[PDB]
Design a protein around this ligand. Sequence first.
Ligand SMILES: Nc1ncnc2c1ncn2[C@@H]1O[C@H](COP(=O)(O)OP(=O)(O)OC[C@H]2O[C@@H](O)[C@H](O)[C@@H]2O)[C@@H](O)[C@H]1O
Length: 169
Amino acid sequence: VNSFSGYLKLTDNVYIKNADIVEEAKKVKPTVVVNAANVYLKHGGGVAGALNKATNNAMQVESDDYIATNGPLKVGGSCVLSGHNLAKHCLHVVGPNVNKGEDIQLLKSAYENFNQHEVLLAPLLSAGIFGADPIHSLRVCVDTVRTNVYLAVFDKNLYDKLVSSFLEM
Ligand SMILES: Nc1ncnc2c1ncn2[C@@H]1O[C@H](COP(=O)(O)OP(=O)(O)OC[C@H]2O[C@@H](O)[C@H](O)[C@@H]2O)[C@@H](O)[C@H]1O
C-alpha cells in the first residue's frame, strides 16, 4: 500500500513523477487517489474520465448517487467516495474552471482539501480541461499542501517544463 517509486522530491511533502495516474494507482495501491472533478461529479475527458473508465463506470454511478442524495459540490470543495479497484478512497476535488470565468484563487481552496489526508496520489488540479496554467497549479500545490502529495504528470514535455519552472525558486 502507498508504495510510491520513481518520484522526484520537490519539497518535504510534494513529489512529482512523469506517469499516467491510472497506471500509478494500480502499481502503488494508494489509500487516496485524487480526481480532478466538477461540481456535478460528471466525469468527462481528463483524469476524471480515465479514472471512471478503469472502474468500469462504477465511479460515475456512485457519483450520481452521491449527487442525488447530497447535491452538487461547491467549487474549491471535495468529497470522499470509494476508490474501487484503484485505491481505498477517491477524493473528488473541484478546482476552478477558468474557461467558465471561475476565480483562480479558489485553486488554493481546492488544494487545501489535500491536507485532510496523510498521503495522496493526485494530478494537477484545473490544469487541463479547466484551463489553468500547469505551472501556476503546481505553485499553489507547493504552497498550500502540507501532507504528502505524489503528483502524476503524464506528458513528458510538461513534466520537464514543470520541473524547470520550479527551479525558479
Ligand atoms: N490520465 C492522466 N494522468 C495524469 N495526468 C493527467 C491525465 N489526464 C490528464 N492529466 C493532466 O492532469 C491535469 C488536469 O487535467 P484535467 O483532468 O482535465 O483536470 P481539470 O483541468 O481540473 O479538469 C476538470 C474537468 O475535467 C473533466 O475530466 C472533469 O470531469 C471536469 O469537468 C492536466 O495537466 C492534465 O494534462
